């Protein structure tokens, strides 16, 4: 405990120093790391107070850019076994975060499903200690298209962590956060958005968000062509396609007036701008869906719909009260906990 | 890489194909397990089938994946069927975990077994008992007595216990240990007394465990006959000293009734000499 | 090492007996 800590720290200092003092590139210091990594291997259960991620970590970050150091998987996979599960849990949990990242960037999110299943097994740690876990976790769920779930996890990530390295970490989370609003199709206010991230960086997301709020396709295509790069950079490309659908879906919704008849022709004029002449087909899908609902006659060239003045006269507020009380109540129990 | 291509080959019916695939699979388990864990169920269908002869090999593989999943108990069950592809002293963590857990299974049964005739219960696993026989032998090679008695008490089997007691001069140290333990660990009478009773049989074969120890067990068990018989041989041999040691012990410790039966037998025989 | 095992067991049992009593004590005191 008292002797252990200087020996490890010397090793740790050894590693800081070799980067661009015994290297000039980020693949030459590595030779030196690998022989030193032995030490971790050597003592098994003669310790648990350690940090042992760093060596492997330096090697590992570089593979994330788009480089080939895929060897590292093999190495992390062995370590998850060395810790029993019932022994040396907190250190195992950290490792699992670094493996999960590596996998996320490149292919098969499916292997994460399993990782999650592992994650909930008897631990002496908590997976909310480093928020980064939530961030990775969120992308997984996002793909699967639970916009809500991803929102929770990301927002919890934002709590109790930025006020230092707020720089890089808030920007990555923040970019995904915006996208999730677009995906969910419910997009908040423009005032809010400014202050998150670095202002320069905020700008490409904002142009995209504005286009989607207007709900006009042509602008969405023009901006998107410019910003091929972001999606590429991030390592989440699939989003580029997914968003296309969303504009049209907002557009029908946007145009909700009032009267027992709206002319079909009227809807079609607004709609003309969104789509050449695929209008009725879209509309039909929309009504059927139950997001809005209506009756259409092409025969009399009118859409007939239902009227509402009966909000606050049925259960929709009842669900709200119940959900809202609950939030306050958990913290009220919590204050007492102290 | 994807595990999928390989995993599929087993789903196809052609027993050569399976066996080919199987050889690949046993090697690749550690790297792939996460992906393999979905597919476990089909692998098991093949193991259940006797229309496939590589049933023992399959079991071994399935089990490794359940260890990596974290279901030890389940892994064991398939593992007993593998049979002869179970091996001791390979000096692995996989092996250590399962032999340990086996003692525990035997323990799980003993409770139940106590309330029914004692030795073994009507449902037993011959295969499970066998791993335990092997564990003993393992431990005998080291020649450690302190370990030896710990396991025997703990697994709650008398038959193991008997074998263990060897040699003369180490045995009074060892017996003192066992005596304190049986009292202090067990507040369960049925078992606890049984071990003392097994121990008596052990005592007679030596010239002594301790002359005092021979008296103490009588006082615990309360068998007035047993004192009488031991005492009586002492008269004949003309061991005055051995005889006197008996009498101060019993007087102090025991009750009026206990004493009366013992004097009755003595008084018929004569004055002790 | 496996001789140790009974010795540890003794500690565990003791605590569970003590532990429950404390809950009970809390209730009584309230009243």
């Amino acid at each position: 405990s008292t002797p252990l800590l200087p020996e490890v720290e010397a090793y740790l200092q050894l590693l800081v120093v070799i980067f661009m003092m015994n290297s000039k590139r980020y693949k030459e210091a590595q030779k030196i790391s690998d022989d030193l990594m032995q030490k971790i291997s050597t003592q098994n259960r003669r310790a648990l107070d350690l940090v042992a991620a760093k060596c492997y970590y330096y090697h590992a970050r570089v593979y994330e850019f788009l480089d080939k150091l895929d060897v590292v998987r093999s190495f992390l996979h062995a370590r998850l076994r060395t810790a029993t599960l019932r022994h040396d849990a907190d250190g195992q949990a950290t490792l699992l975060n670094l493996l999960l990242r590596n996998y996320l960037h490149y292919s098969l999110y499916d292997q994460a499903e399993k990782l999650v299943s592992k994650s909930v097994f008897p631990e002496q740690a908590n997976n909310n200690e480093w928020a980064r876990y939530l961030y990775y976790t969120g992308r997984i769920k996002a793909i699967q298209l639970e916009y809500s779930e991803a929102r929770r996890t990301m927002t919890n990530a934002l709590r109790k962590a930025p006020q230092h390295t707020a720089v890089g970490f808030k920007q990555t989370v923040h970019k995904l956060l915006i996208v999730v609003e677009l995906l969910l199709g419910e997009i908040p206010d423009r005032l809010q958005f400014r202050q998150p991230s670095l202002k320069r960086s905020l700008m490409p997301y904002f142009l995209l968000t504005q286009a989607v709020r207007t709900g006009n396709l042509a602008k969405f295509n023009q901006v998107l062509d410019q910003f091929g790069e972001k999606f590429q950079a991030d390592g989440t490309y699939t989003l580029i396609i997914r968003l296309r659908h969303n504009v049209i879906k907002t557009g029908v919704r946007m145009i909700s007036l009032s009267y027992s008849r709206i002319s079909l022709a009227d809807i079609a004029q607004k709609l003309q701008l969104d789509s050449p002449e695929d209008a009725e087909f879209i509309v039909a899908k929309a009504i059927r869906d139950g997001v809005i609902e209506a009756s259409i006659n092409h025969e009399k060239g009118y859409v007939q719909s239902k009227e509402m003045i009966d909000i606050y006269s049925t259960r929709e507020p009842q669900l709200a009260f119940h959900q809202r009380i609950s939030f306050c109540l958990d913290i009220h129990n919590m204050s007492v906990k102290a | 890489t994807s595990a999928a291509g390989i995993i599929s080959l087993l789903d196809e019916d052609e027993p050569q194909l399976k066996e080919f695939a199987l050889h690949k699979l046993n090697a690749v388990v550690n790297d792939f397990w996460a992906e393999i864990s979905e597919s476990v169920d089909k692998i098991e269908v093949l193991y259940e089938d006797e229309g496939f002869r590589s049933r023992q090999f399959a079991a071994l593989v399935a089990s490794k994946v359940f260890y990596h999943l974290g279901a030890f108990e389940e892994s064991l069950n398939y593992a007993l069927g593998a049979g002869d592809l179970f091996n001791v002293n390979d000096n692995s963590e996989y092996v250590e975990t399962i032999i340990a857990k086996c003692i525990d299974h035997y323990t799980k049964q003993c409770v139940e077994n106590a309330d029914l005739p004692e030795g073994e219960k009507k449902p037993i696993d011959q295969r499970l008992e066998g791993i335990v026989n092997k564990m003993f032998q393992r431990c005998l090679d080291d020649h450690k007595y302190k370990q030896a008695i710990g396991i025997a008490l703990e697994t709650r089997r008398l038959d193991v216990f008997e074998k263990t007691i060897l040699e003369s001069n180490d045995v009074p140290g060892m017996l003192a240990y066992s005596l304190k333990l049986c009292m202090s660990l067990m507040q369960n009478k049925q078992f606890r007394n049984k071990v003392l009773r097994v121990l008596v049989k052990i005592y007679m074969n030596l010239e002594k465990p301790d002359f005092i120890n021979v008296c103490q067990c009588l006082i615990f068990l309360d068998d007035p006959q047993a004192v009488s018989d031991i005492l009586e041989k002492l008269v004949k041999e003309d061991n005055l000293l051995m005889a006197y040691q008996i009498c101060f012990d019993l007087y102090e410790s025991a009750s009026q009734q206990f004493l009366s039966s013992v004097i009755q037998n003595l008084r018929t025989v004569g004055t002790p000499i | 090492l496996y001789s140790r095992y009974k010795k540890l067991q003794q500690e565990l049992e003791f605590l569970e007996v003590q532990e429950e009593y404390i809950k009970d004590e809390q209730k009584n005191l309230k009243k």
Binding site: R86 | - | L12, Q26
Partner: peptide
């Protein structure tokens, strides 16, 4: 080997609860 160690962990954990819970009682 693992059995004595696992046994050892659970005692460590229980005691920290008991100390805490106890501390509320004295107060």
């Amino acid at each position: 080997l693992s059995k004595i160690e696992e046994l050892q962990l659970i005692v460590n954990d229980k005691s920290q609860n008991l100390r805490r819970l106890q501390a509320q009682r004295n107060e």
